[PDB]
Amino acid sequence: SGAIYVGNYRVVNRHLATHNDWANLVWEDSSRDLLVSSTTAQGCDTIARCDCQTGVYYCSSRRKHYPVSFSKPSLIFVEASEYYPARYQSHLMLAVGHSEPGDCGGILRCQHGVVGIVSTGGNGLVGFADVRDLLWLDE
């Protein structure tokens, strides 16, 4: 689990979004595994505006942050799940690292802020849904 809180927005994995998320839906992309919901409290997270390919992500299944190199956001084939067990996920970044289902929502961050959230795992690769293109999150 985990979310990004920036201004009056909550960013979550679309597959973990709650009733309240969908009740206050701002934007969702099933191809990206992202949902943004509206919040009453003003969030204080900073979204990275950059093309960093290095950062640190939180891995709940190890209670540890890992520094990683990650690929630029791309259209990536993803398998096995129950929300979508096989399809192309867009705006996805991979790194070599540990991820399990429950690690989804872990934040990946660089010096410039939040890069994205853990979205996919399997074969020792961790997929992060990029948020850096969502310039609207900051206004």
Ligand SMILES: CN(C(=O)[C@H]1CCNC1)c1ccccc1
């Ligand atoms: C196992 N796996 C793949 O098969 C991808 C890797 C690049 N193209 C196919 C995958 C997908 C998403 C996240 C982590 C791993």
Ligand SMILES: [Zn+2]
């Ligand atoms: Zn950066």
